[PDB]
Amino acid sequence: SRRWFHPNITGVEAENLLLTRGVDGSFLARPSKSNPGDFTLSVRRNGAVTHIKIQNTGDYYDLYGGEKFATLAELVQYYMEHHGQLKVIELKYPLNCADPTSERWFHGHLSGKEAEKLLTEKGKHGSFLVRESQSHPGDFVLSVRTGDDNDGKSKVTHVMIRCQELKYDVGGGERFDSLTDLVEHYKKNPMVETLGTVLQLKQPLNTTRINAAEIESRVRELSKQGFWEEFETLQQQECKLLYSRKEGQRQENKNKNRYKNILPFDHTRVVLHPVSDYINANIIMPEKKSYIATQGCLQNTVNDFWRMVFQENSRVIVMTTKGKSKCVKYWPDEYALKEYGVMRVRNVKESAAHDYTLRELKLSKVGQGNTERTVWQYHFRTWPDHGVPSDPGGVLDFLEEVHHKQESIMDAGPVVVHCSAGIGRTGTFIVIDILIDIIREKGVDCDIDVPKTIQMVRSQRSGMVQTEAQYRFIYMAVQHYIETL
Numbered sequence: 207s208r209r210w211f212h213p214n215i216t217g218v219e220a221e222n223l224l225l226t227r228g229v230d231g232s233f234l235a236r237p238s239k240s241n242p243g244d245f246t247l248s249v250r251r252n253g254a255v256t257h258i259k260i261q262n263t264g265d266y267y268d269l270y271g272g273e274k275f276a277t278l279a280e281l282v283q284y285y286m287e288h289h290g291q292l293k294v295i296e297l298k299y300p301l302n303c304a305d306p307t308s309e310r311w312f313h314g315h316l317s318g319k320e321a322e323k324l325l326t327e328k329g330k331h332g333s334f335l336v337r338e339s340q341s342h343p344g345d346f347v348l349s350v351r352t353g354d355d356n357d358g359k360s361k362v363t364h365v366m367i368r369c370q371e372l373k374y375d376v377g378g379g380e381r382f383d384s385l386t387d388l389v390e391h392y393k394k395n396p397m398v399e400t401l402g403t404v405l406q407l408k409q410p411l412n413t414t415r416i417n418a419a420e421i422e423s424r425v426r427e428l429s430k431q432g433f434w435e436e437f438e439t440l441q442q443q444e445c446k447l448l449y450s451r452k453e454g455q456r457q458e459n460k461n462k463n464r465y466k467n468i469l470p471f472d473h474t475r476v477v478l479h480p481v482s483d484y485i486n487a488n489i490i491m492p493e494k495k496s497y498i499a500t501q502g503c504l505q506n507t508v509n510d511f512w513r514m515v516f517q518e519n520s521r522v523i524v525m526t527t528k529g530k531s532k533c534v535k536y537w538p539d540e541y542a543l544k545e546y547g548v549m550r551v552r553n554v555k556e557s558a559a560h561d562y563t564l565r566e567l568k569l570s571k572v573g574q575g576n577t578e579r580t581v582w583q584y585h586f587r588t589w590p591d592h593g594v595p596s597d598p599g600g601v602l603d604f605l606e607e608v609h610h611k612q613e614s615i616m617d618a619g620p621v622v623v624h625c626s627a628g629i630g631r632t633g634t635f636i637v638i639d640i641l642i643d644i645i646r647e648k649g650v651d652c653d654i655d656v657p658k659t660i661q662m663v664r665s666q667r668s669g670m671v672q673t674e675a676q677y678r679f680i681y682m683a684v685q686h687y688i689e690t691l
C-alpha cells in the first residue's frame with residue numbers, strides 16, 4: 207500500500223505524528239503546502255525528525271541529495287530495499303495515514319438521495335461508496351448495490367458506520383482505526399444480511415467517466431479544488447503498479463539508462479533482436495494505434511534507438527523537448543547522411559512550423575537498399591521551461607498533424623514518443639492522443655475516463671503523467687478539442 211502518504215498534513219502535524227505515533231525508522235511522505243508541485247519525506251531518527259525535500263517540475267521526482275524516480279512508491283521501495291543510500295537515514299516503518307480523502311470509494315459530503323441515484327444509474331453488482339452521514343456529524347454511511355447485472359431484481363443497501371472515540375464500526379464486532387481498514391476488512395469478509403444477501407464490495411463506484419459532450423461542465427465542477435482530489439486518488443493507486451524492472455538493473459544495462467532508477471517494466475519493454483537486447487523503452491497499447499514511450503538519447507544508446515525504430519517499423523517520432531541537456535542529437539544535419547552502427551539515416555528535408563520542426567528522415571539498414579522507409583520526426587519546440595502550455599491549441603494542432611501523418615502510412619508501426627525521462631511530457635502527449643483519438647473516431651457521443659486512461663498507461667510504463675498541472679492540462683486539451691469541433 208501507499209498509506210505512508212499523508213495528503214492533508216502540515217509539517218508541524220508531520221513532526222508531532224512521527225514523535226508520538228512513530229519510533230526511530232518511521233517515515234511519511236507529504237505534499238509541500240508552501241510550494242505545490244513539491245513533496246517532503248519526513249523521517250524519524252535518534253528521537254528527532256528530518257525532512258527531505260522532493261521536487262517534481264514535470265519530468266521526474268528529484269530527491270534532494272539522492273536519486274531521481276518515476277513515482278513516490280518506486281522511490282520508497284528503492285530506499286526501503288537499498289540500505290545506506292539515503293544520507294545515513296533508514297526507512298523502516300511506514301507511518302500509515304487514516305485519512306480517507308484519497309480513496310476511490312470515499313465521496314465526502316455527498317447526500318443520501320444523490321448517492322442512491324448514482325448507484326442506480328452508474329453502479330452494478332458490488333458497486334460501493336462511503337460518504338459522510340447527513341444525520342450524525344462524525345459518522346459515515348456505506349452504500350452498496352447488490353443483485354442482478356427499473357428492472358426490479360437489484361437493490362441499494364445503506365450501512366451506518368459509527369465513529370466512537372476515534373474508531374469505526376458497523377454497529378457490532380471489530381472496531382477499526384480507519385475507514386480504509388474497515389472497508390478492506392469487509393471487502394475480505396463480506397457482511398451477510400439475515401435473509402442471505404451478501405453485501406459484496408466488488409468495486410468502487412465510477413464517477414470520473416463522462417460523456418465527452420459534458421467535458422465543459424465537468425472541468426467547471428473540478429475547478430470550483432476538485433482536480434486535486436481526483437489526481438491524488440489516482441496517485442494513491444500507483445502502489446498497484448510496482449511491477450519488476452529487473453533488466454534495467456543488470457550491470458550490462460546500467461549505463462544505457464539516462465536516469466539510473468527510472469526503468470522500463472519487463473513485461474512491456476521493447477526487446478531488441480553480450481546483452482544487446484535492452485533499451486529504456488516501453489510499448490504503450492490502449493485498452494487501433496500504439497506508441498513507444500522512451501527516454502531522450504544518451505551518446506551510448508543512439509545506435510539502439512535506431513535499431514528500435516527499424517525493428518518496430520515506426521514511421522513517426524514525437525520529440526517533446528527543445529538550461530540542461532535533456533537529449534543528445536540523434537539525427538543528421540539537413541541534407542546529410544550518417545551511419546549509426548548498422549543503421550543509416552539521411553535527413554532529406556527540415557520544415558519549420560510555429561510550434562514544431564518536421565525532419566523527413568530516410569532510415570535503412572546498411573548493405574540493404576530495399577529496407578528503406580521514411581521516418582517523420584516531429585520536434586515540438588514551444589513547451590515552456592516551467593509548467594505546462596497555457597493554451598492547448600499548439601499541442602492539439604501538432605498531434606492532429608502527427609495523427610494524419612501516421613494514418614497516411616499503411617501498416618506503420620508504433621509512434622515513438624520521447625522527452626527527458628520518457629514519463630512526464632511523453633505521458634501527457636500519449637494520453638491526450640489516446641483521448642482525442644476516441645473523440646475523433648466515435649464522435650462527441652462517447653464515454654471517456656481521464657484517470658482510468660492514465661492508470662492503464664501507467665501500468666505499461668512507470669509514472670506516465672507526472673504532475674497535477676499536466677493532469678489539468680490533459681482535461682483542458684480534451685475540452686479545447688471538443689469546443690473546436
Ligand SMILES: Cc1csc([C@@]2(CN)[C@@H]3CCN(c4cnc5c(-c6cccc(Cl)c6Cl)[nH]nc5n4)C[C@@H]32)n1
Pocket residue numbers: 306307308309310311312313314315412413414435436437439440443655657658661
Ligand atoms: C474529500 C473528497 C471529496 S470528493 C472526493 C473524491 C476522491 N475520494 C470522490 C470519489 C470519486 N473520485 C475518484 C474516482 N476515481 C478516480 C480514479 C480512477 C478512476 C478509474 C480507474 C482508476 Cl484505476 C482510478 Cl485510480 N482516479 N482518481 C479518482 N477519483 C473523486 C472524488 N474526495
